[PDB]
Amino acid sequence: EDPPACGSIVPRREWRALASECRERLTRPVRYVVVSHTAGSHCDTPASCAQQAQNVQSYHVRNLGWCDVGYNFLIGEDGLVYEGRGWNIKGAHAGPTWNPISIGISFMGNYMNRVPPPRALRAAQNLLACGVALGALRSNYEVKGHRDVQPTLSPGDRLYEIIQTWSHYRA
Amino acid sequence: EDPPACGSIVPRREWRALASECRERLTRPVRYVVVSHTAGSHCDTPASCAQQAQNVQSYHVRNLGWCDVGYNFLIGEDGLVYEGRGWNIKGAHAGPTWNPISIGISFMGNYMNRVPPPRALRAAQNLLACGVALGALRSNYEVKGHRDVQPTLSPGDRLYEIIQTWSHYRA
Amino acid sequence: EDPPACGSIVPRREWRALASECRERLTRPVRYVVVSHTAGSHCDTPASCAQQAQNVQSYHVRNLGWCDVGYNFLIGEDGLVYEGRGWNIKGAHAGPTWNPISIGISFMGNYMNRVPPPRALRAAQNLLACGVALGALRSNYEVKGHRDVQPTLSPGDRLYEIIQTWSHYRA
Amino acid sequence: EDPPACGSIVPRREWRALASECRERLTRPVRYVVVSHTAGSHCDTPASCAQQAQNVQSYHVRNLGWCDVGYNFLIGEDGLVYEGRGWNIKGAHAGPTWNPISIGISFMGNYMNRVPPPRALRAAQNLLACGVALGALRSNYEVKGHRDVQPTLSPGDRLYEIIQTWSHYRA
Ligand SMILES: C[C@@H]1O[C@@H](O)[C@H](O)[C@H](O)[C@H]1O
Numbered sequence: 316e317d318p319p320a321c322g323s324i325v326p327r328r329e330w331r332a333l334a335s336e337c338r339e340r341l342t343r344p345v346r347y348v349v350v351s352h353t354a355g356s357h358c359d360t361p362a363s364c365a366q367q368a369q370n371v372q373s374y375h376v377r378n379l380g381w382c383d384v385g386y387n388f389l390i391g392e393d394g395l396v397y398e399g400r401g402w403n404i405k406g407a408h409a410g411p412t413w414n415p416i417s418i419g420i421s422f423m424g425n426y427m428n429r430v431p432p433p434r435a436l437r438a439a440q441n442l443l444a445c446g447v448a449l450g451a452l453r454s455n456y457e458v459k460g461h462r463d464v465q466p467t468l469s470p471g472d473r474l475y476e477i478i479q480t481w482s483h484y485r486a
Numbered sequence: 487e488d489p490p491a492c493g494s495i496v497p498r499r500e501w502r503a504l505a506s507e508c509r510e511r512l513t514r515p516v517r518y519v520v521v522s523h524t525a526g527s528h529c530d531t532p533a534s535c536a537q538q539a540q541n542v543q544s545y546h547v548r549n550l551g552w553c554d555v556g557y558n559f560l561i562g563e564d565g566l567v568y569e570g571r572g573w574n575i576k577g578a579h580a581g582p583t584w585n586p587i588s589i590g591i592s593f594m595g596n597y598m599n600r601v602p603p604p605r606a607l608r609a610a611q612n613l614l615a616c617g618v619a620l621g622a623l624r625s626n627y628e629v630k631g632h633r634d635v636q637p638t639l640s641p642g643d644r645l646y647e648i649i650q651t652w653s654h655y656r657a
Numbered sequence: 658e659d660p661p662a663c664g665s666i667v668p669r670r671e672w673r674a675l676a677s678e679c680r681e682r683l684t685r686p687v688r689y690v691v692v693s694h695t696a697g698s699h700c701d702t703p704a705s706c707a708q709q710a711q712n713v714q715s716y717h718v719r720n721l722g723w724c725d726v727g728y729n730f731l732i733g734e735d736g737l738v739y740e741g742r743g744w745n746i747k748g749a750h751a752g753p754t755w756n757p758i759s760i761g762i763s764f765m766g767n768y769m770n771r772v773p774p775p776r777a778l779r780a781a782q783n784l785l786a787c788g789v790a791l792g793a794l795r796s797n798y799e800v801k802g803h804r805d806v807q808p809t810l811s812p813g814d815r816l817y818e819i820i821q822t823w824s825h826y827r828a
Numbered sequence: 829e830d831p832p833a834c835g836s837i838v839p840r841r842e843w844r845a846l847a848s849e850c851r852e853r854l855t856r857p858v859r860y861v862v863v864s865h866t867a868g869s870h871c872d873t874p875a876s877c878a879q880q881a882q883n884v885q886s887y888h889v890r891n892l893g894w895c896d897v898g899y900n901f902l903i904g905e906d907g908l909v910y911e912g913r914g915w916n917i918k919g920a921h922a923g924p925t926w927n928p929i930s931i932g933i934s935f936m937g938n939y940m941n942r943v944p945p946p947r948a949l950r951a952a953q954n955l956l957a958c959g960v961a962l963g964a965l966r967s968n969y970e971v972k973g974h975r976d977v978q979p980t981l982s983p984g985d986r987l988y989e990i991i992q993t994w995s996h997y998r999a
Pocket residue numbers: 353354425467468469470471
């Protein structure tokens with residue numbers, strides 16, 4: 316029961332998401348953070364990004380039949396963090412061997428030959444710090460690239476190149 | 487990484503702020519937090535809100551002749567916190583009585599007949615948390631409305647209405 | 658494909674290890690072997706050793722917050738070999754440079770001024786034969802002392818004198 | 829504040845160190861300090877201590893092939909602090925997770941069953957004080973024992989008790 320200053324996330328209700336049907340739990344504290352991109356359209360306004368959020372979720376629920384948006388958190392170029400499955404629920408984002416032991420945050424857009432705006436990157440790092448503050452992540456958490464845990468170009472050449480310079484990125 | 491979980495603050499360099507020339511320091515740790523509103527135009531996108539912060543500052547500088555924008559921090563309806571004088575430079579937002587002992591945060595726009603979006607209110611409270619963590623604010627910091635410390639209509643009926651709701655608000 | 662049996666290794670399950678969280682893997686055939694000691698208290702029975710193994714691991718994962726006991730294997734004076742991270746998962750025993758290119762077997766005890774029993778040396782020398790037969794080690798693997806790659810007394814003077822004698826030892 | 833303020837540190841060239849080859853930089857203000865012990869022999873004269881520093885260095889340099897002695901600063905029982913790689917160069921003293929966010933100070937000697945002389949203990953505190961005065965160390969910095977972040981007997985049972993008494997110790 317000790318929260319030492321977290322960070323500000325846009326609530327599910329706010330971006331008008333569909334109700335989650337997920338019930339599987341992620342045992343705290345989490346050791347790995349897997350970064351990826353949605354390979355979708357980017358948005359740079361709280362308005363546009365709220366929409367982007369649902370398109371991704373509806374695509375995961377309505378078409379892939381998952382219980383909720385696959386990622387735990389979403390990052391927008393508007394500089395806000397959109398709440399996915401959150402800290403407590405296991406998500407579907409990086410394969411069966413990795414989904415149970417990691418939090419998956421995904422930047423909204425296709426960063427293969429484009430870079431996230433400084434605020435996007437800030438929001439993401441800040442988010443992780445809150446994680447450690449809340450104890451959802453261990454202090455020695457490890458940030459891994461999506462392409463480091465499975466065959467995919469995600470999170471995109473330019474964004475990947477960037478997260479490799481992060482304090483907690485492990486080979 | 488500005489020390490702990492400091493809820494993504496937009497740097498001076500990012501909103502193209504004029505160089506500050508103030509040099510009166512703030513006696514750490516501060517006890518009060520005065521809230522206000524610029525009573526100017528409100529903005530709802532990072533793009534528009536950076537352009538607005540610029541307007542506010544150039545006005546305090548080019549026209550009023552102050553060493554820099556008067557507030558320590560500016561909050562946008564874009565749900566982002568814009569760096570002003572910061573946690574260490576004494577502001578110019580609530581008179582000679584309160585400037586040297588409180589931190590000043592202003593919401594961009596006029597909140598007499600308008601209400602700030604939740605993402606903005608969220609950004610502010612999240613800003614104060616990072617305040618304590620940093621040691622710039624007393625864990626037992628008290629929030630006052632601009633009205634409470636100076637004869638002014640700011641922070642606008644509607645917004646003042648809400649800050650009284652804050653657990654740290656005093657009379 | 659015709660044996661090769663050399664697996665006289667006590668399984669993690671058998672000494673009641675904690676669930677490992679480690680996921681990075683070594684590439685067969687591993688070229689180097691780094692011998693170290695735990696600088697702790699020794700054990701000369703299958704009972705006291707399973708105890709000591711739980712201890713070393715308890716320290717690594719509970720105090721150091723590591724994904725699992727850092728060694729790949731642990732040799733006891735009871736003449737047995739205790740499965741640590743095994744032949745496939747990169748251990749954490751000699752640093753960022755050697756961890757990826759080697760396997761770390763560690764003698765449970767402090768041999769600064771003691772020589773391990775002949776049955777422990779045998780167990781170790783024997784374990785290495787395994788690696789070769791299974792293909793986990795290059796037939797021409799090189800043995801290095803812990804102090805040879807890191808600032809430490811490990812594996813102890815007496816034991817170090819011994820390993821310098823080994824045929825696969827190398828500069 | 830007020831100057832000059834710092835302590836008495838024996839310059840690198842005074843103990844005739846070999847030219848550092850390290851280029852990786854630390855980011856001040858540093859948050860953590862890791863106390864360790866060379867585990868080797870002690871010295872009680874500027875004469876023998878200046879010699880010791882070299883032994884340690886040559887060992888980390890030509891035996892391990894490192895860019896310089898692993899520690900940022902070395903403490904001698906002569907009552908002096910020997911400059912290691914200093915306040916700005918990342919050292920190699922406590923693993924890849926701590927080297928980038930800490931300053932490594934090592935007491936030359938072995939303190940498993942030997943306490944350091946008051947002189948040594950003062951040199952160490954003065955150093956840290958001087959580190960805060962210089963903006964090299966964060967004011968609320970935290971101290972940790974080598975063994976708290978890595979598998980090692982260091983800094984020695986005796987010293988470990990001594991530092992666990994410090995106002996900045998936090999494990
Ligand atoms: C072609 C493929 O398309 C999507 O799955 C992503 O953008 C991925 O990164 C890219 O490699």
